[PDB]
């Protein structure tokens, strides 16, 4: 199915983590199409900045055959 | 701010604002004038409160201003009164916003390890905030002192 | 089965305490209310049959589907069972009015009532409607009669209504 | 949870009718008590920690409970006991504000006896701790609102019974 | 029975279960238990019944069966009735009274926490070919095995592993959250823990595996049950992973771990002859050498 | 009610009630007489608001009472007016409690599933409650009808 | 119930074959330990109340449980706890004489955990009381018979836990 | 008391009680319940107020309890806490009476001469009463704290 | 969980004392046995699967358990039993290294009997498999370390039976 | 202990113990004789460290034992020395176990909450444990002091 390749940077705002936090601070990952809205809203209410998003798999305007 | 908190809760439940929260916005908007009155009283009496509370802190803990302490010297006492002024400015921001969120976001997270790295006694800064509370309550209106004392002892509980 | 003095004794016994001034004040309040409780219970004994008949009549005219087909007051067997249940509610309400405690209602009325009514299909809404109808008519009759204190009469019926009732909100 | 207003509304809704005059009377009685409840809640919320401090000093300190071999000995168990007394004080404040023990039935007494029996928490010692909370709160707020708080604190004790 | 005489409204269901011929196969004494639970408040029990509580073991959704050895203990739980849960770590880190301590790691008191703390292999092209002992891959493979264990509490078999999801997480194409999502959405989980079980039983067990936490009660169970009715098991998995408590307790790099216990499960773990501390429910007398022995000592 | 909502929010935050929340509860128990006056006004005019609003709804959407409609016929019209009276009673409960929680726990959770099981047009029921709002604002004063219209508009927003 | 003899008979019977030599060694061990079991049961039946007395004195007396608010506050509940310990000691002697823990799982344990949960009985504290019973019994009777009693007392504790 | 002052003011000019004095006595009677509540919480918390205020006094002024000081020693420290308890009892008497004349008649006439004979620093006694004011004002509502702090500040003014 | 050192420390902590002579003697005994425990654990971690293979060959294979109608019939059920024996041997090695059975009671024996009775797993056959593990382990490791492993294997047998 | 840590990690990864963990465990087993020597020294001289470190603590921080302090009085001083003896016993437990796990589980989790409820200054308790560290380090050999100092400044870091 169609997948989104995203790149984001989230800050810590409530506490100072004492462990290594690069992997969850600045990261790139593949999120599915049907889960990208909720994943995006989770990041966007968390307070991060999504610096990049692209459609990694599939093509735009896919009426049928998106699965 | 309670406006920010209500918007955060509404977006967390993914809905518009409930009428009880709208009435909370009504009450906050109504009380904002009195809260702003507290704000200009505090920023009109900011110099006297900071100076006399710092003097009372110096008489309470003479080892702070003594040689060998953190606040020995004119530049060190300047940094100490700058910290007092910054904390009182945060209390003015808090009585403006009606919430402890600006204090917690600007000057109250990681202050323990910050003053640990600076070598400053966090008990001494908490005592300084307590004396600023006492001077502000003496110099300032009493129900308004009960309003500002929530932010004051929130700072006390967070630092100590 | 526990009345007000017994549940006060149990509450103090759990903490291992002697009767303090608050306990003596509660006992004094119970003992000064007791004459009005006895008068109210004698009134309950007086008009019991006529009040259960007219309360059932008011219930079945408010909700007329009970005495119709598919209702649970349809036959005379169902009608007599409903009258027996309402008389049971009035009798234990009289017991709770004498005891000044709803622990008798909990122990002997409410702890299986939802289970029996769901087992037999008996409605739980018109039941508490009839209980509250009994409460209103008894409170009005006590206001009509020479009763100085009538505030305690609503407590066992409202306890039955709340415990047997379903959590709407 | 149910307060007095929600209990009246629930009763009238299960009745299926609108609010009659008895509902008006109960609502006005709750609104009459509401200012005293709010004042008591504000005083308890201000003095939340000091009531727990005085109750622990009155009932649990310098005993076999806090001595070695006791269940309040280790400091994580001590801090847990402090947090439990904060739980009881805060939920009793909630019950006093609501005028009802429904929140105590749903959130405090729900499995608390099995929880404490699994943990090994002393039942009569925490009952005496809630009793010390009741005496300190009655001394700190007054006879009337202290009695009102003590009703729900005794409800918590009888649930622990 | 029912029609012979008037029936007392306090032993109704107990009498109904006793008058059936299956009464000598319920070995649980029903009457005394219900009479005691009448006086006492609501017990430590799932909101939908005593049978809806799995055993708090490492693997296997072991539920009580209603027919085999009947032990049903119904209790009228209403909607907003939170079950008191016992935190594995520090007691002050319980989220009931300390909701900002959801992300605090239970050091030395709770379960071991597995994270992507080390860098994934091949993250950068700074190691331009060669580099035979690129060291962090056994830690990542143990993290894969720990995620496997958390989703399915036991180690899997050869043909059952989701090697494509393993490779995507090792390369960094997905995170730990999406890896746990795909492991729970795999048809092996559907075959093992969703299909052979009652629906709310599977919801409760899946909540305990995906959050390390029994459900608080009717609100969360109603939410996941409505999602299971409308959209299905994949969407209940999606909602459980995308819940705010999941994101608070676990990051994008943290495998879930067992955070809270039922009191009955904690009693099963730490009420046996071993692993029971001496000061749990016993008067510990301060043992001392006798005073005459002390006086006779030199 | 507002007390239960504040207690639920403070319990979720694991804290006592805010001073602003306590001030809102004080304002609520002082305005209790006014809101119970709105309650007795609505119970006095229970049968007229539903009458005029049902007349406006039936002249606005005649497909409701047309043949083939969901509320076609005398008994289905009576059921529609009974649902209207149910929502008026829930608005009375909401303006008494000061919160939309007694409204939403009885008549707004699962309403879409119920009305799609019954085939009933949800937007037409929303228009019916809009007409109830306009009739209540007709036979009510200005600010109190705005107060009741807050809860009415909550019903409109959560239903439509 | 099953003793060791009925246990090995049923174990032979379920697979349907006759007694082998390895099954005969089970009877040899049981008839070796039978008179030790007889004298141990005689000693415990002689001193049945004494073991419970020293166990309650060692573990349960002067603890939280006897204090007001505890599970052994009233004299009725104290007598019930003494009755439960008499049950545990007598059924442990039954299991020790039988040489198989079938009577415990059949008449003591299969239904006791949820009964204690419904009553609010502290399972950890009664497990500690059974441990005190085991220690006093092992002091009274000996090492081998003491650990033989302790196996079935730990069986009762494991069934309770 | 206020009743005593009104009767005395009427009797000095040899008339019956004026309508102004009747209104003042009516205000005294209506505020009697709140004044009784303030006195009740003060006498309920009488031990912790004296304990915390004595601790704050001895931290802020160590010279009075250091050797060579007036209160050095456990007996003199207990006597200082006894004096603080005496003045707290007089504050409760003034709160009950509605004015300051019991405090004036019992413990504020000749207080300077008494403490001068005793050798005690009267400004440090005033600091002790100020710490009692702060601790007691932290234990009540805002209006109750202001009402009790009125009598406390009267004791401050009479001592300094 | 806890080892022998943590058991001694917990006993001294609950008893409210420092490390006396007997506690130091127990610690010295554990430090004496630690080298043998490490060597036996290394031998078991080497020959982990061989113990289970020889145990199922000695006790379980070529019987009605393996044949249809038996609990270890399918390949899924066979792999389940092999994994269960792997877990039992690994946790017995854990208990042998620690010197305490607390990990056995916390992570294995909690609910294990109820689990096996719900699944229909033969308790006697599983016990015989653990005995087969015991003799194969004692043959492969040594005498004293084999006895030390057999103590915890018999603890698993007592907890499961 | 390090044995319990290794078994916990092996149990968490569902594997037998790594041979690296095997030489760390047998290294701890062989080197435990020095640990028992340190524990024997501290147990034999346990009252000496407590007495000298208490005296040095009370000289460095006179406010905690002056009147108004948390530890003022003979019984409160005895309770403070009992707390120091408790922490020294926990240090012996950590030395015996080779790990900070018994110290953290028995007397470091919730210590801030406990001492905040008691009113005791946690920085002064940290100063007390630091004085115990200096007295013990001067009282034993250099390598033994370096071994015990890890547990000591772990306690210092957890308090501070
Ligand atoms: C200090 C030298 C200068 C500076 C600091 C500064 N840091 C941050 C926040 C972050 N820092 C990191 C870095 C790391 N995370 C890791 O895990 C590692 C390796 C172990 C490193 C090096 C990250 C990821 C952040 C983001 C927050 C987080 O902790 O995840 C900030 C920003 C804080 C904010 O968002 O307000 C700042 C400002 N800036 C200066 O001026 C100092 C000279
Ligand atoms: C008088 C000549 C006639 C009459 C009138 C009447 N009946 C009622 C009310 C009731 N009638 C019944 C009867 C039945 N129940 C059954 O199961 C059967 C079939 C065998 C019958 C016939 C019952 C139970 C009632 C009470 C419930 C109700 O209100 O319907 C009334 C009303 C009394 C009142 O309002 O108080 C009247 C006036 N009944 C006759 O049999 C005559 C034909
Ligand atoms: C009348 C208000 C409503 C009504 C009643 C109704 N009840 C039954 C049957 C039973 N009711 C009970 C309840 C009790 N048993 C007790 O011991 C007590 C307290 C002392 C109570 C309250 C029981 C056990 C039964 C079953 C057998 C019996 O009658 O004792 C029926 C009969 C249903 C049937 O088909 O058999 C009816 C009709 N029904 C209504 O609609 C009114 C709301
Ligand atoms: C203090 C008066 C006594 C006491 C207390 C004590 N409590 C615990 C730990 C827990 N207490 C609870 C209880 C609750 N959880 C809830 O959500 C609520 C309602 C809001 C309650 C009342 C729980 C669940 C625990 C477990 C830890 C956790 O929070 O998850 C302990 C610790 C037990 C331990 O072994 O560490 C103690 C000691 N003990 C006493 O002696 C005092 C008499
Ligand atoms: C004094 C009149 C006689 C007597 C007393 C004595 N009692 C004990 C010990 C206990 N007594 C009880 C009894 C009760 N607990 C309750 O809660 C109630 C009812 C409210 C009763 C009657 C209990 C439980 C104990 C055990 C102490 C505990 O709390 O755990 C002793 C001590 C015996 C011992 O060996 O410890 C004594 C001496 N003895 C006399 O000679 C007087 C005639
Ligand atoms: C023959 C193609 C190969 C082979 C066979 C071989 N098998 C065994 C032993 C066993 N095989 C099984 C397998 C199953 N049991 C089932 O119920 C099912 C599914 C229906 C399967 C696949 C089992 C359980 C055994 C154990 C013995 C028993 O059944 O009781 C052996 C013996 C191993 C030994 O050393 O004893 C052998 C030799 N070996 C080959 O080389 C051929 C490739
Ligand atoms: C092997 C000696 C005998 C046997 C084994 C057998 N086991 C299973 C399946 C399960 N075993 C468990 C047990 C545990 N859960 C735990 O948490 C622990 C300790 C960490 C243990 C030991 C469980 C839960 C299962 C269920 C499936 C799962 O693995 O999650 C089976 C399969 C039964 C089935 O229906 O699938 C078998 C056959 N049976 C024998 O006959 C051997 C003698
Ligand atoms: C001494 C360095 C400082 C100090 C001490 C002080 N402590 C208390 C009271 C208590 N402290 C504890 C703490 C513990 N219990 C444990 O089991 C452990 C770890 C093993 C610790 C650390 C407890 C339980 C108490 C209560 C005493 C009791 O048994 O009930 C006091 C007394 C406070 C009071 O008002 O009673 C004091 C004075 N004070 C200082 O100033 C030094 C910094």
PDB file of C-alpha atoms in Angstrom, chain E residues 31-139:
ATOM      1  CA  UNK E  31     -23.503 -18.480  49.124  1.00  0.00           C
ATOM      2  CA  UNK E  32     -20.900 -17.426  51.713  1.00  0.00           C
ATOM      3  CA  UNK E  33     -18.862 -15.538  49.092  1.00  0.00           C
ATOM      4  CA  UNK E  34     -21.878 -13.575  47.873  1.00  0.00           C
ATOM      5  CA  UNK E  35     -23.065 -12.902  51.438  1.00  0.00           C
ATOM      6  CA  UNK E  36     -19.639 -11.563  52.428  1.00  0.00           C
ATOM      7  CA  UNK E  37     -19.321  -9.490  49.247  1.00  0.00           C
ATOM      8  CA  UNK E  38     -22.774  -8.073  50.022  1.00  0.00           C
ATOM      9  CA  UNK E  39     -21.404  -6.382  53.145  1.00  0.00           C
ATOM     10  CA  UNK E  40     -17.962  -5.554  51.774  1.00  0.00           C
ATOM     11  CA  UNK E  41     -17.438  -3.067  48.887  1.00  0.00           C
ATOM     12  CA  UNK E  42     -16.559  -3.865  45.271  1.00  0.00           C
ATOM     13  CA  UNK E  43     -13.752  -6.435  44.937  1.00  0.00           C
ATOM     14  CA  UNK E  44     -10.522  -6.513  42.958  1.00  0.00           C
ATOM     15  CA  UNK E  45     -12.129  -7.840  39.796  1.00  0.00           C
ATOM     16  CA  UNK E  46     -12.541  -6.934  36.134  1.00  0.00           C
ATOM     17  CA  UNK E  47     -15.690  -4.923  35.414  1.00  0.00           C
ATOM     18  CA  UNK E  48     -17.164  -7.684  33.234  1.00  0.00           C
ATOM     19  CA  UNK E  49     -16.613 -10.473  35.754  1.00  0.00           C
ATOM     20  CA  UNK E  50     -14.107 -12.625  37.612  1.00  0.00           C
ATOM     21  CA  UNK E  51     -13.559 -14.740  34.500  1.00  0.00           C
ATOM     22  CA  UNK E  52     -12.351 -11.708  32.525  1.00  0.00           C
ATOM     23  CA  UNK E  53      -9.063 -11.562  34.462  1.00  0.00           C
ATOM     24  CA  UNK E  54      -6.112 -13.455  32.939  1.00  0.00           C
ATOM     25  CA  UNK E  55      -3.431 -15.014  35.073  1.00  0.00           C
ATOM     26  CA  UNK E  56      -0.534 -12.584  35.530  1.00  0.00           C
ATOM     27  CA  UNK E  57       2.045 -14.889  33.963  1.00  0.00           C
ATOM     28  CA  UNK E  58       4.700 -14.391  31.300  1.00  0.00           C
ATOM     29  CA  UNK E  59       2.814 -15.922  28.366  1.00  0.00           C
ATOM     30  CA  UNK E  60      -0.530 -17.528  27.675  1.00  0.00           C
ATOM     31  CA  UNK E  61      -3.932 -15.870  28.015  1.00  0.00           C
ATOM     32  CA  UNK E  62      -5.233 -18.259  30.665  1.00  0.00           C
ATOM     33  CA  UNK E  63      -8.814 -17.350  31.532  1.00  0.00           C
ATOM     34  CA  UNK E  64     -11.305 -18.999  33.887  1.00  0.00           C
ATOM     35  CA  UNK E  65     -13.970 -20.881  31.947  1.00  0.00           C
ATOM     36  CA  UNK E  66     -17.615 -20.366  32.920  1.00  0.00           C
ATOM     37  CA  UNK E  67     -18.629 -23.959  32.205  1.00  0.00           C
ATOM     38  CA  UNK E  68     -15.559 -25.868  33.432  1.00  0.00           C
ATOM     39  CA  UNK E  69     -15.544 -25.599  37.269  1.00  0.00           C
ATOM     40  CA  UNK E  70     -18.033 -22.701  37.520  1.00  0.00           C
ATOM     41  CA  UNK E  71     -16.567 -19.811  39.498  1.00  0.00           C
ATOM     42  CA  UNK E  72     -18.415 -16.747  38.185  1.00  0.00           C
ATOM     43  CA  UNK E  73     -18.536 -13.828  40.633  1.00  0.00           C
ATOM     44  CA  UNK E  74     -20.598 -11.000  39.110  1.00  0.00           C
ATOM     45  CA  UNK E  75     -20.376  -7.536  40.643  1.00  0.00           C
ATOM     46  CA  UNK E  76     -22.301  -4.371  39.641  1.00  0.00           C
ATOM     47  CA  UNK E  77     -19.510  -2.184  38.318  1.00  0.00           C
ATOM     48  CA  UNK E  78     -20.829   1.084  36.912  1.00  0.00           C
ATOM     49  CA  UNK E  79     -19.241   3.178  34.157  1.00  0.00           C
ATOM     50  CA  UNK E  80     -16.648   5.402  35.850  1.00  0.00           C
ATOM     51  CA  UNK E  81     -15.262   2.803  38.259  1.00  0.00           C
ATOM     52  CA  UNK E  82     -11.462   2.769  38.162  1.00  0.00           C
ATOM     53  CA  UNK E  83      -9.760  -0.448  39.229  1.00  0.00           C
ATOM     54  CA  UNK E  84      -6.972   0.095  41.755  1.00  0.00           C
ATOM     55  CA  UNK E  85      -3.757  -1.176  40.152  1.00  0.00           C
ATOM     56  CA  UNK E  86      -0.384  -1.793  41.783  1.00  0.00           C
ATOM     57  CA  UNK E  87       2.648  -0.255  40.089  1.00  0.00           C
ATOM     58  CA  UNK E  88       5.656  -2.507  39.527  1.00  0.00           C
ATOM     59  CA  UNK E  89       8.237   0.204  40.149  1.00  0.00           C
ATOM     60  CA  UNK E  90       8.309   2.841  42.877  1.00  0.00           C
ATOM     61  CA  UNK E  91       4.957   3.353  44.564  1.00  0.00           C
ATOM     62  CA  UNK E  92       5.164   7.138  44.164  1.00  0.00           C
ATOM     63  CA  UNK E  93       5.475   6.677  40.389  1.00  0.00           C
ATOM     64  CA  UNK E  94       1.877   5.439  40.168  1.00  0.00           C
ATOM     65  CA  UNK E  95       0.038   7.515  37.575  1.00  0.00           C
ATOM     66  CA  UNK E  96      -3.137   7.773  39.687  1.00  0.00           C
ATOM     67  CA  UNK E  97      -1.522  10.304  42.012  1.00  0.00           C
ATOM     68  CA  UNK E  98       1.548  11.156  39.921  1.00  0.00           C
ATOM     69  CA  UNK E  99       0.365  11.445  36.302  1.00  0.00           C
ATOM     70  CA  UNK E 100       3.592  13.141  35.183  1.00  0.00           C
ATOM     71  CA  UNK E 101       5.544   9.994  36.139  1.00  0.00           C
ATOM     72  CA  UNK E 102       4.133   7.872  33.301  1.00  0.00           C
ATOM     73  CA  UNK E 103       7.470   7.975  31.477  1.00  0.00           C
ATOM     74  CA  UNK E 104       9.613   7.269  34.536  1.00  0.00           C
ATOM     75  CA  UNK E 105      11.582   4.062  34.144  1.00  0.00           C
ATOM     76  CA  UNK E 106      11.108   1.562  37.025  1.00  0.00           C
ATOM     77  CA  UNK E 107      14.748   1.070  37.950  1.00  0.00           C
ATOM     78  CA  UNK E 108      15.436  -2.094  39.999  1.00  0.00           C
ATOM     79  CA  UNK E 109      11.781  -2.488  41.048  1.00  0.00           C
ATOM     80  CA  UNK E 110       9.815  -3.051  37.836  1.00  0.00           C
ATOM     81  CA  UNK E 111      10.450  -4.850  34.567  1.00  0.00           C
ATOM     82  CA  UNK E 112      13.523  -4.285  32.422  1.00  0.00           C
ATOM     83  CA  UNK E 113      13.053  -1.559  29.802  1.00  0.00           C
ATOM     84  CA  UNK E 114      14.371  -2.109  26.271  1.00  0.00           C
ATOM     85  CA  UNK E 115      15.047   0.912  24.049  1.00  0.00           C
ATOM     86  CA  UNK E 116      16.777   1.984  20.844  1.00  0.00           C
ATOM     87  CA  UNK E 117      19.467   3.706  22.926  1.00  0.00           C
ATOM     88  CA  UNK E 118      22.238   2.383  20.711  1.00  0.00           C
ATOM     89  CA  UNK E 119      22.445   3.498  17.116  1.00  0.00           C
ATOM     90  CA  UNK E 120      21.011   1.167  14.503  1.00  0.00           C
ATOM     91  CA  UNK E 121      23.565  -0.458  12.157  1.00  0.00           C
ATOM     92  CA  UNK E 122      24.017   1.292   8.839  1.00  0.00           C
ATOM     93  CA  UNK E 123      22.437   4.525  10.085  1.00  0.00           C
ATOM     94  CA  UNK E 124      25.129   6.661   8.434  1.00  0.00           C
ATOM     95  CA  UNK E 125      27.448   6.128   5.460  1.00  0.00           C
ATOM     96  CA  UNK E 126      30.376   7.236   7.614  1.00  0.00           C
ATOM     97  CA  UNK E 127      31.389   3.569   7.807  1.00  0.00           C
ATOM     98  CA  UNK E 128      32.030   3.458   4.061  1.00  0.00           C
ATOM     99  CA  UNK E 129      31.978  -0.339   3.403  1.00  0.00           C
ATOM    100  CA  UNK E 130      33.969  -3.016   5.215  1.00  0.00           C
ATOM    101  CA  UNK E 131      33.479  -2.493   8.969  1.00  0.00           C
ATOM    102  CA  UNK E 132      33.091  -6.123   9.965  1.00  0.00           C
ATOM    103  CA  UNK E 133      32.469  -5.701  13.712  1.00  0.00           C
ATOM    104  CA  UNK E 134      29.921  -2.925  13.504  1.00  0.00           C
ATOM    105  CA  UNK E 135      29.134  -3.593  17.118  1.00  0.00           C
ATOM    106  CA  UNK E 136      25.546  -2.607  17.651  1.00  0.00           C
ATOM    107  CA  UNK E 137      23.509  -5.335  16.049  1.00  0.00           C
ATOM    108  CA  UNK E 138      23.260  -7.950  18.823  1.00  0.00           C
ATOM    109  CA  UNK E 139      21.636  -5.326  21.053  1.00  0.00           C
TER     110      UNK E 139
END
